[PDB]
């Protein structure tokens, strides 16, 4: 009598109606999760999980460092960052044994790209921290400023245009005692410690964005990790949709069908939330050194620079804080540079406690965070570690009646464990839990569940009895990209086609997307169909065209003609789709090369393609 | 985000375009409406002047023209895409899950859709057009009240490329399942070979006699079959699979099949197995077989078994058994997993390289036609039937027209509307007489079934009631006939009307998803009538010509526009100022007003004193 | 130069080259010679692996391709194929990615083309790669050809054809007058020794980045290089604490309990506009002079009412400015009359700055800006109130809100353009599904809300970015089409924006919104806490006892919106797409199990019953139409009430739903920490009404399913 959509599941199995539980399917308008207190809590938790790790004082940045590796083994189920180097190396060795040569081929096939990439490759990317201006900036302008400053400071080897040359230039600049920054004329002298702390910065508006001196090394290490993952089957990256869908079915078939009827199989789905706390750059450096065994030393240095630099990473602290006095109706803002020495009476209990915890780390308005990682820079290496842990589960390594396998993608994991009895299943799951704890892999027991094999999910790819329900992508914008008629039409139709091909977009939904596309395009460009009664200035001349043409379907949609696109015919260019139907006189007028208007996407060079003023 | 808003706002101004200076001395300083097509301002940082997109439209519509050369030759990539798409075909879609640009169609969430692109290859225009036309006619006639008479009507009421299809049929030796069925229904001679399982079966040695056998299926279902006893030699002919088969009394001994791909070879092999009438496959039947066509009519058990095997045959392959093979020149085996093997092959089914092909036959026979178009020769074996007609559909090199009453829902909703109005106008005299005398039968005419589909289901009964009441008023008022209104409004009355109070100022017809609107009064884009030339245009496509009937009111009053009201022509300021259609519900019997019907014209209306009733 | 390559080389090969160079992130425009080199390499590889097949007996036949391309695909596919081939045939794993694989010879072959002499290229390639059982095919444009062991898998005809292709290509470059550049660009890629030394600061940093018990990076490198595992994992596990374990709690039917809802004062409406209680001043068919302009439409809609009274406050804004709302409403009416008195009315009219206008907007209540230095010594100077809002109990008004949002309206709220025809049967299925769903939902209130929000937000954004320092007036207009087919234009109220000098997307613009209504706010006053209620007229409504007079209320409220929120509310059309996606996914899920397109019997059958509600006698079902409307209403509610709380609750409750589902199918499920999941879910139920209603739905489903 009163609506209750959840009750739909009372007859429909949940896996079918999973889209019911995705409230947004878009980008919300609030942007909750960025600021300063979040950084405070992140640093505090990172250093808390390493509570018993050894403390030391850095010699270059002059900031404390925490090393939890090889620390005491955890005694409780709470998260532990005590990852043992020997266990990690043994796991990597076992992975190599099961997949001989993998690291060798990865290294030798990546050396070329290490020696081939150009400087401009760094231009592509997300926002970057500009040490020159001390604020997040576009990658291209940051690169221009960096080359300008280095040229001023007499470091012009990067002029060769090779990425490795620029990395050597960065090394030389970092070795220099001090440098000059000229802003427009204001000159700033950054000493060795100042420049070093700036270069190891992690700005926070991939939540964290490193500086520019660390881009190339991160790129190289991620390239090696991707190359290693490619040969790995359990790795969930960098495959697309269809292959990811097939991975789940293949794993289930391998684990279940081969097993005897007597044997019992179970599957656990688990989420590794807050996955960067317990993984340290030092363990990554260890695995990197292991990977490049018996390899040229220059390549080893280039590849190991990244985790070495990250282990001394400095984390910036938001923009600051905002205080308000209701009594006097006043508002003020304080920066993070003054948060080191300031009263704690303004803040509340939790905020003042966090400030108390993080006070002894703020160096020059930038906390020091050696342990733990930051989101979205070394994801592939984490996937490599996960697949190694999984590979350690074969029947030969386990040396037990039970066994297990599964998939890991560094954000979600699924594990199928089978054994002759229920006690066998319990033993298998417990042993996997402990083994993954030893390496520092943390399984959240409050967001994981176990059930008989057949039904589970992984990276939102919900799986039920051989059926996958990929929901890992959001719907893009079906609007006017704002270049020109033909350009916008082509890019948008290609966008919808591509989303149909891979992102698993239903046909009917694609049809409504095309409908809304046509609506928005006509509204924006004021090119409405001649038959429609809508009125505008452009409709006058447009109307004339509708009368002149002998074939309505020949006219381009931008010219007021009908939209003949559909699921079957989406890849064809709009101009080419109406080539024959277009009247000969219209064809000649439209594509006249001598037009005065003209002095990626697939489109024809018609007169409708102009550059906006 | 930002680019879309920026472009939306930028296009607002008068001269958002930038063009070279030459345009100043090449196009008029303004438009026929005095609108200026350029501005003297020069683009910042350059010498280009600022102009408006109105100049773009002016150049597009009446700009100087040039010869189109180097365009077809330079664009050698997308043109092939267009050719492949348009000349390609399609097929049935199965819900289970050249080819590098059609990924979305072929593969989806959990379904598969076959597609074979085209290019410039294959047969000629006339043969393909005849085959496709016959396929459509047979497929639609499958579901008619009586397929035989219906099919004859469609064949006699259609033409191919401006030439009546009967002449082509009589003067064309092209062979196809649909064409052969149409010829057999027409009573002419058809090929001796019988089209079964999608391939043509031609006997060339041996013979057999028919016996009625009851067989218990593997699913515990008893089926009666007409099993053939006696050695027989058949050839299975197909474009992508040609095979030679021997059969005996409930025994298959040899089958050599050659096909371009493994799928066609597997289909031919399955057809051979089902035709062999082997007991093992009878024991291999699983599930309940109730396959039916679009007409839901039960078919013979052999066709059901063939369809079931075509669905899948994995559980049947291993059941045949294991036999040895010998290595021979041009000899290929058949594994249970459908893969050639040099050392082993599946029982009684081999694969060759060249196979049996090349020479064809020119033999024709006299045949009889049964109730549901099942063509059966004198001997008794089934020759043809729509159940064996392929689902492939393609393109027509030359225009093909279908004037029948059930081919309208093929070219599209616009075609449905145009053809419904063409049928109305062509039968104007008879439809007028029927409406005047016994309109109830007219409102039940099947010829208006397509229109009932376009009109939304939620608002078809109410539309029908409004139309019925309006037409009853038009009949009972007299002296105010208007043919255009009758033709425009008749088709909406097909549904079983129900009482309503709404006064529909426009009715909606769904075309290509978007819903067009046709106004009850005056002209509409869907329905335009030019009295200056006396021509009816439907969505821009001519529908015929109207001749005024021996009833008309040429002095105002029109009683079939407003339900329960009579419009009295031009407005009169003396009466009550313009009213609203909603308010009209309060006027008393015989009251008069100056209602605003629509557009920008005021019409005086008087409330009917009487009341028009309907069934 | 690239034009010649594009026009000569076939589209497929150039597309493959473009994809390959896009994988490596190299722009073709900057590197021209390498473009031609890669195109030629791909072409020669494909020709080497073209028109070659293996017969079923094993002999080489020319018409199972004899040569399989490995370099014509991406890295992942090539690696998978080569791994499978090696595993099946037990061939030594290649070090690199081979160009082609010969099935007859069952070996990997590499293709090489060079401008200079073939012998140097073969020597360098063999030295670089060839170590054991490897073959390379080397060709050149000079017409000299050679390979390994003088063995050519290709026959004489194919070798001659490839030589002719190379010769004609070379003649083309020579004719174009650019072969000299092509030859000079080749240099053998001199592999001078590469040196990368860590020194100075970096050496210190590296030495300070090792595990415990390590003094320098070199010691760790030596240790790991000599490392070989020996039962370390087993020893650590044996010495690991026994208490650490991921125990499985037996999950039976009786274990789950309903989510504990918060207690406190009832919730309150917080939407940008009224949903259940909106009122419309509508014109059935706008045919007046000057159409399209929102101001004239608003004036005409206003002129249709004559029940204006003297405004007075019935339910005042407790924590706010009540009188100034009345004063600004009076100002709005007077300004509209003044506009009526005008002759040449411009497109829009900006309200003059007045005290009441500023106070209602909040301009005079906005704290000023001053550096922290000059305000540190303030007794009550505190950090912004980042305190968790107080808990609010569940209120029944949100249930009614959703119920009425799911009802069927009587107008065509959404108008959509046309597309091409459908020829494929899958296109027919898609069109059928889309049309059925659209016919179902096009008359639902959710579409009315969508269009109202879109119009309001687009008008507000245009006004904000048009005039920066003007307090413009903005009618709340919505155009629809009745069942009869007349273009109705409704006006719900008015909005006045504040100063709109916006530099950042998150900059907040303050506006004051006045919305008509006919609901007495003394029935459920708690629902109305942020609003000021005036009684600005009386309306005559027809009922079974004639035309009865009832008060006409006005809700005035000061709100603020950000440009990104404005765009979010301007892009609500995607709710229809989401709701479709949902119903289509359910269709596919039910179809796959049965293996047949099931939409025909899903929609037209009208014999299915999907539980969609509850009644005093028990649960209640509905139709696929009810399901579609419910899903669209849920999507619109989620869009309007966008908050992190909603997404958090949905994400944390999806897992509980999945576990209950697994329980239903007798899958013997188990939970490692059920209480933790319960707390994580309940962490999102504090004050929001939408999330509280969702939790109530979840509890109802829990108590029903387990029975």
From TrEMBL, chain A:
Binding site for Mg(2+) 1: 270
Main localisation: host cell
EC category name: transferase
Pfam families: Flu_PB1 (PF00602)
Catalysed transformations (reactions): RNA(n) + a ribonucleoside 5'-triphosphate = RNA(n+1) + diphosphate
Subunit structure comment from the entry: Influenza RNA polymerase is composed of three subunits: PB1, PB2 and PA. Interacts (via N-terminus) with PA (via C-terminus). Interacts (via C-terminus) with PB2 (via N-terminus); this interaction is essential for transcription initiation.
GO biological process, one term: viral transcription
EC number per UniProt: 2.7.7.48
Protein name per the record: RNA-directed RNA polymerase catalytic subunit
Motif (Nuclear localization signal) on chain: 185-194
Domain RdRp catalytic: 252-449
Residues engaged in binding Mg(2+) 2: 271, 412, 457
Annotated spans, Promoter-binding site: 215-222
Family: Belongs to the influenza viruses polymerase PB1 family.
Keyword Transmembrane recorded: no
InterPro entries named in the record: RNA-dir_pol_NSvirus (IPR007099), RNA_pol_PB1_influenza (IPR001407)
Lineage: Viruses, Riboviria, Orthornavirae, Negarnaviricota, Polyploviricotina
Chain's gene name: PB1
Domain of life: Viruses
Residue spans of biased composition, Polar residues class: 55-64
Chain residue ranges for the region called Disordered: 50-82
Location within or outside the cell: Host nucleus; Host cytoplasm
Keywords, comma-separated and alphabetical: Eukaryotic host gene expression shutoff by virus, Eukaryotic host transcription shutoff by virus, Host cytoplasm, Host gene expression shutoff by virus, Host nucleus, Host-virus interaction, Inhibition of host RNA polymerase II by virus, Metal-binding, Nucleotide-binding, Nucleotidyltransferase, Phosphoprotein, RNA-directed RNA polymerase, Transferase, Viral RNA replication, Viral transcription
Automatic annotation (TrEMBL), chain B:
Influenza RNA polymerase PB2 second domain mapped to chain residues: 1-64
GO cellular component: host cell mitochondrion; host cell nucleus; virion component
Record's keyword annotation contains Hydrolase: no
Keywords attached to this entry: Cap snatching, Eukaryotic host gene expression shutoff by virus, Eukaryotic host transcription shutoff by virus, Host gene expression shutoff by virus, Host nucleus, Host-virus interaction, Inhibition of host RNA polymerase II by virus, mRNA capping, mRNA processing, Viral transcription, Virion
GO MF annotation terms: RNA binding; RNA-directed RNA polymerase activity
Domain Polymerase basic protein 2 helical: 121-190
UniProt keyword GTP-binding, yes or no: no
Site, as annotated: Avian adaptation: 498
Listed SUPFAM superfamilies: PB2 C-terminal domain-like
All copies of domain Influenza RNA polymerase PB2 C-terminal, residue ranges: 554-615
Motif Nuclear localization signal in this chain: 607-610
Residue ranges of every copy of the Influenza RNA polymerase PB2 sixth domain listed in the record: 402-551
Compartment list: Host mitochondrion; Virion; Host nucleus
Domain Influenza RNA polymerase PB2 CAP binding: 191-401
Highest taxon above the source species: Viruses
Protein family according to the UniProt entry: Belongs to the influenza viruses PB2 family.
Subunit note: Influenza RNA polymerase is composed of three subunits: PB1, PB2 and PA. Interacts (via N-terminus) with PB1 (via C-terminus). Interacts with nucleoprotein NP (via N-terminus).
Reported function: Plays an essential role in transcription initiation and cap-stealing mechanism, in which cellular capped pre-mRNAs are used to generate primers for viral transcription. Recognizes and binds the 7-methylguanosine-containing cap of the target pre-RNA which is subsequently cleaved after 10-13 nucleotides by the viral protein PA. Plays a role in the initiation of the viral genome replication and modulates the activity of the ribonucleoprotein (RNP) complex.
Protein name: Polymerase basic protein 2
Organism field: Influenza A virus
Lineage: Viruses, Riboviria, Orthornavirae, Negarnaviricota, Polyploviricotina
Automatic annotation (TrEMBL), chain C:
Record has Ion transport as a keyword: no
Post-translational modification: Phosphorylated on serines and threonines by host kinases, including human casein kinase II.
Gene Ontology CC: one annotated term: host cell cytoplasm
Binding site for Mn(2+) 1: 41, 99, 110-111
Record Pfam families: Flu_PA (PF00603)
E.C. designation(s): 3.1.-.-
This protein's UniProt keywords: Cap snatching, Endonuclease, Eukaryotic host gene expression shutoff by virus, Eukaryotic host transcription shutoff by virus, Host cytoplasm, Host gene expression shutoff by virus, Host nucleus, Host-virus interaction, Hydrolase, Inhibition of host RNA polymerase II by virus, Manganese, Metal-binding, Nuclease, Phosphoprotein
Keyword Transcription tagged: no
GO biological process, one term: viral RNA genome replication
Subcellular localization(s) per the UniProt record: Host cytoplasm; Host nucleus
Domain of life: Viruses
Binding positions for Mg(2+) 1 per the UniProt entry: 41, 99, 111
Cofactor: Mn(2+)
Family per record: Belongs to the influenza viruses PA family.
Name of the featured protein: Polymerase acidic protein
Organism: Influenza A virus (A/Zhejiang/DTID-ZJU01/2013(H7N9))
Recorded name of the encoding gene: PA
């Amino acid at each position: 009598m009163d609506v209750n959509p959840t009750l739909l599941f009372l007859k429909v199995p949940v896996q079918n109606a999973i889209s019911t539980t995705f409230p947004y399917t878009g980008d919300p308008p609030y942007s909750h999760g960025t600021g300063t207190g979040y950084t405070m809590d992140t640093v505090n938790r990172t250093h808390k999980y390493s509570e018993k790790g050894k403390w030391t004082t850095n010699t270059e940045t002059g900031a404390p460092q925490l090393n939890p590796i090889d620390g005491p083994l955890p005694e409780d189920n709470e998260p532990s960052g005590y990852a043992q180097t020997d266990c990690v190396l043994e796991a990597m060795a076992f992975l190599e044994e099961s997949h001989p040569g993998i690291f060798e081929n990865s290294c030798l096939e990546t050396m070329e790209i290490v020696q081939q990439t150009r400087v401009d490759k760094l231009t592509q990317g997300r926002q970057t921290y500009d040490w020159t201006l001390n604020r997040n900036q576009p990658a291209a302008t940051a690169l221009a400023n960096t080359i300008e400053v280095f040229r001023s400071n007499g470091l012009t080897a990067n002029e060769s245009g090779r990425l490795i040359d620029f990395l050597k230039d960065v090394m030389d600049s970092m070795d220099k005692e001090e440098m000059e920054i000229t802003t427009h004329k204001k000159k700033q002298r950054l000493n060795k410690r100042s420049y070093l702390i700036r270069a190891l910065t992690l700005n926070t508006m991939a939540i964290a964005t490193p500086g520019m001196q660390i881009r190339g090394f991160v790129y190289f290490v991620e390239a090696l990790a991707r190359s290693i993952c490619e040969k790995l089957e359990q790795s969930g990256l960098p495959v697309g949709g269809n292959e990811k869908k097939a991975k789940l079915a293949n794993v289930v078939r391998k684990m279940m069908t081969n097993s005897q009827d007597t044997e019992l199989s179970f599957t656990i789905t688990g989420d590794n939330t807050k996955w960067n706390e317990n993984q340290n750059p030092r363990m990554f450096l260890a695995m990197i050194t292991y990977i490049t065994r018996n390899q040229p030393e220059w390549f080893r240095n280039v590849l190991s620079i990244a985790p070495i630099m990250f282990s001394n990473k400095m984390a910036r602290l938001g923009k600051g804080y905002m205080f308000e006095s209701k009594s006097m109706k006043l508002r003020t803002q304080v920066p993070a540079e003054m948060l080191a020495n300031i009263d704690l009476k303004y803040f509340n209990k939790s905020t003042r406690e966090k400030i108390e915890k993080i006070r002894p780390l703020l160096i020059d308005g930038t906390a020091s965070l050696s342990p733990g990682m930051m989101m979205g820079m070394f994801n592939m290496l984490s996937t490599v570690l996960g697949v190694s842990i999984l590979n350690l589960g074969q029947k030969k390594y386990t040396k037990t009646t039970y066994w297990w396998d599964g998939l890991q993608s560094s954000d979600d994991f699924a594990l199928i464990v089978n054994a002759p009895n229920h006690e066998g299943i319990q033993a298998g799951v417990d042993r996997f839990y402990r083994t993954c704890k030893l390496v520092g892999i943390n399984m959240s027991k409050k967001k994981s569940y176990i059930n008989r094999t057949g039904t589970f999910e992984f990276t939102s790819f919900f799986y039920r009895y051989g059926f996958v329900a990929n929901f890992s992508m959001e719907l893009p914008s079906f609007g006017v990209s704002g270049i020109n008629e033909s350009a916008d039409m082509s890019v948008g139709v290609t966008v919808i086609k591509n989303n149909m091909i891979n992102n698993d977009l239903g046909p009917a939904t694609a049809q409504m997307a095309l409908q809304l596309f046509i609506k928005d395009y006509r509204y924006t460009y004021r090119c409405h169909r001649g038959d429609t009664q809508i009125q505008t200035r452009r409709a006058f001349e447009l109307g004339k065209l509708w009368e002149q043409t002998r074939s309505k379907a020949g006219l381009l949609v931008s010219d007021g003609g009908p939209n003949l696109y559909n699921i079957r015919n989406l890849h064809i260019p709009e101009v080419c789709l109406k080539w024959e139907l277009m009247d000969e006189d219209y064809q000649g007028r439209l594509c006249n090369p001598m037009n005065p208007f003209v002095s990626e996407y697939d489109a024809v060079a018609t007169t409708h393609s102009w550059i906006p003023k | 985000k930002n680019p879309a808003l920026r472009m939306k706002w930028m296009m607002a101004m008068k001269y958002p375009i930038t063009a070279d200076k030459r345009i100043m001395e090449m196009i008029p300083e303004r438009n026929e409406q005095r609108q200026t097509l350029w501005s003297k301002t020069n683009d910042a940082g350059s010498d280009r002047v600022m102009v408006s997109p109105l100049a773009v439209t002016w150049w597009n519509r009446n700009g100087p023209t040039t010869s189109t050369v180097h365009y077809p030759k330079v664009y050698k990539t997308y043109f092939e895409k267009v050719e492949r798409l348009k000349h390609g075909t399609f097929g049935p879609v199965h819900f289970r899950n050249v080819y590098i640009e059609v990924l979305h169609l072929t593969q989806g969430t959990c379904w598969e859709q076959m597609y074979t692109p085209g290019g410039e290859v294959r047969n000629d225009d006339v043969d393909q057009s005849l085959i496709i036309a016959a396929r459509n006619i047979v497929r639609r006639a499958t579901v008619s009240a009586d397929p035989l008479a219906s099919l004859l009507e469609m064949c006699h009421s259609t033409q191919i490329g401006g030439v009546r299809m009967v002449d082509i049929l009589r003067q064309n030796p092209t062979e196809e399942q649909a064409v052969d069925i149409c010829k057999a229904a027409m009573g002419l001679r058809i090929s001796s070979s019988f089209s079964f399982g999608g391939f043509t079966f031609k006997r060339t040695s041996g013979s057999s006699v028919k016996r009625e056998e009851e067989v218990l299926t593997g699913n515990l279902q008893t089926l009666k079959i007409r099993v053939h006893e006696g050695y027989e030699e058949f050839t299975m002919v197909g474009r992508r699979a040609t095979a030679i088969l021997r059969k005996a009394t409930r025994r298959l001994i040899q089958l050599i099949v050659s096909g371009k791909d493994e799928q066609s070879i597997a289909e031919a092999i399955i057809v051979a197995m089902v035709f062999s009438q082997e007991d093992c496959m009878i024991k291999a039947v699983r599930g309940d077989l109730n396959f039916v066509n679009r007409a839901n009519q039960r078919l013979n058990p052999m066709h059901q078994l063939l369809r079931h095997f075509q669905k899948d045959a994995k559980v049947l392959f291993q059941n045949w058994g294991i036999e040895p093979i010998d290595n021979v020149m041009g000899m290929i085996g058949i594994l249970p997993d459908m893969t050639p093997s040099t050392e082993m092959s599946l029982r009684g089914v081999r694969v060759s390289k060249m196979g049996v092909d090349e020479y064809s036959s020119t033999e024709r026979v006299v045949v009889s036609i049964d109730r549901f178009l099942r063509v059966r020769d004198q001997r008794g074996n089934v020759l043809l039937s729509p159940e064996e007609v392929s689902e492939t559909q393609g393109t027509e090199k030359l225009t093909i027209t279908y004037s029948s009453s059930m081919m309208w829902e093929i070219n599209g909703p616009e075609s449905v509307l145009v053809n419904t109005y063409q049928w109305i106008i062509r039968n104007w005299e008879n439809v007028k007489i029927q409406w005047s005398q016994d309109p109830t039968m007219l409102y039940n005419k099947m010829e208006f079934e397509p229109f009932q589909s376009l009109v939304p289901k939620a608002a078809r009964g109410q539309y029908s009631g409004f139309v019925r009441v309006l037409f009853q008023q038009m009949r009972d008022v007299l002296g105010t006939f208007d043919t255009v209104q009758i033709i425009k409004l008749l088709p909406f009355a097909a549904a079983p009307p129900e009482q309503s109070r709404m006064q529909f100022s426009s009715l909606t017809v769904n075309v290509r998803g978007s819903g067009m609107r046709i106004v009850v009064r005056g002209n509409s884009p869907v329905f335009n009538y030019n009295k200056a030339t006396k021509r009816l245009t439907v969505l821009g496509k001519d529908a015929g010509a109207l001749m005024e009937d021996p009833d008309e009111g040429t002095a105002g009053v029109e009683s079939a526009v407003l339900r329960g009201f009579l419009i009295l022509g031009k407005e009169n300021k003396r009466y009550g100022p313009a009213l609203s259609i909603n308010e009209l519900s309060n006027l008393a019997k015989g009251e008069k007003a100056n209602v605003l019907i629509g557009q920008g014209d005021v019409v005086l209306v008087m409330k009917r004193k009487r009341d028009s009733s309907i069934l | 130069m690239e034009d010649f390559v594009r026009q000569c080389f076939n589209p497929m090969i150039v597309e493959l080259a473009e994809k390959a160079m896009k994988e490596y992130g190299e722009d073709p425009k900057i590197e021209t010679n390498k473009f031609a080199s890669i195109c030629t390499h791909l072409e020669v590889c494909f020709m080497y692996s073209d028109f070659h097949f293996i017969d079923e007996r094993g002999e080489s036949t020319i018409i199972k391709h004899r040569f399989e391309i490995i370099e014509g695909r991406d890295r992942t596919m090539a690696w998978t194929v080569v791994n499978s081939i090696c595993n099946t045939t037990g061939v030594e794993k290649p070090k690199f990615l081979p160009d082609l694989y010969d099935y007859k010879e069952n070996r990997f072959i590499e293709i090489g083309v060079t401008r200079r002499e073939v012998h140097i290229y073969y020597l360098e390639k063999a030295n670089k790669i060839k170590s054991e059982k490897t073959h390379i095919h080397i060709f050149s444009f000079t017409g000299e050809e050679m390979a390994t062991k003088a063995d050519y898998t290709l026959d004489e005809e194919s070798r001659a054809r490839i030589k002719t292709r190379l010769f004609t290509i070379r003649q083309e470059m020579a004719s174009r007058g650019l072969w000299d550049s092509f030859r000079q660009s080749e240099r053998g890629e001199e592999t001078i020794e590469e040196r990368f030394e860590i020194t100075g600061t970096m050496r210190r940093l590296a030495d300070q980045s090792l595990p415990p018990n390590f003094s320098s990076l070199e010691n760790f490198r030596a240790y790991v290089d000599g490392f070989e595992p020996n039962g370390c994992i087993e020893g650590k596990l044996s010495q690991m604490s026994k208490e650490v374990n991921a125990r499985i709690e037996p999950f039976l039917r009786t274990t789950p309990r309903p989510l504990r809802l918060p207690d406190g004062p009832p919730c309150s409406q917080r939407s940008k506009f009224l949903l259940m209680d909106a009122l419309k001043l509508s014109i059935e068919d706008p045919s007046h002079e000057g159409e399209g302009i929102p101001l004239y439409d608003a004036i005409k809609c206003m002129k249709t009412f004559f029940g204006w009274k003297e405004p007075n406050i019935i339910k005042p804004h407790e924590k706010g400015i009540n009188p100034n709302y009345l004063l600004t409403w009076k100002q709005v009416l007077a300004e509209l009359q003044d506009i009526k008195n005008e002759e040449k009315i411009p497109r829009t009219k900006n309200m003059k700055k007045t005290s009441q206008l500023k106070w209602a907007l909040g301009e005079n209540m906005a704290p000023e800006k001053v550096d922290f230095e000059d305000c540190k010594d303030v007794n009550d100077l505190k950090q912004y109130d980042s305190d968790e809002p107080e808990p609010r109990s569940l209120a029944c008004w949100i249930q009614s809100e959703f119920n009425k949002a799911c009802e069927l309206t009587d107008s065509s709220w959404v108008e959509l353009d046309e597309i091409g025809e459908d020829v494929a049967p899958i296109e027919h299925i898609a069109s059928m599904r889309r049309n059925y769903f659209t016919a179902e939902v096009s008359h639902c209130r959710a579409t009315e809300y969508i269009m109202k929000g879109v119009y309001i937000n687009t008008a507000l954004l245009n006004a904000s970015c048009a005039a920066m320092d003007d307090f413009q007036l903005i009618p709340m207009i919505s155009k629809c089409i009745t069942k009869e087919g007349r273009r109705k234009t409704n006006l719900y109220g008015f909005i006045i924006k504040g100063r709109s000098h916006l530099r950042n997307d998150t900059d907040v613009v303050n506006f004051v919104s006045m919305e008509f209504s006919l609901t007495d706010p003394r029935l459920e006053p708690h629902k109305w806490e942020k609003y000021c209620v005036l009684e600005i007229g009386d309306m005559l409504l027809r009922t079974a006892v004639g035309q009865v007079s009832r008060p006409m209320f006005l809700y005035v409220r000061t709100n603020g919106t950000s440009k990104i929120k404005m765009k979010w509310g301007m892009e609500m059309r995607r709710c229809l797409l989401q709701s479709l996606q949902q119903i289509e996914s359910m269709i596919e899920a039910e179809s796959s199990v049965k293996e047949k397109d099931l939409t025909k019997e899903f929609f037209e059958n009208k014999s299915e019953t999907w539980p969609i509600g509850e009644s005093p006698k028990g649960v209640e079902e509905g139709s696929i139409g009810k399901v579609c409307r419910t899903l669209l209403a849920k999507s619109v509610f989620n869009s309007l009430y966008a908050s992190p709380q909603l997404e958090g609750f949905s994400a944390e409750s999806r897992k509980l739903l999945l576990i209950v589902q697994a329980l239903r199918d007798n899958l013997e499920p188990g939970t490692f920490d059920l209480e933790g999941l319960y707390e994580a879910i309940e962490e999102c139920l504090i004050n929001d009404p939408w999330v509280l209603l969702n939790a109530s739905w979840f509890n109802s489903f829990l108590t029903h399913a387990l029975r």
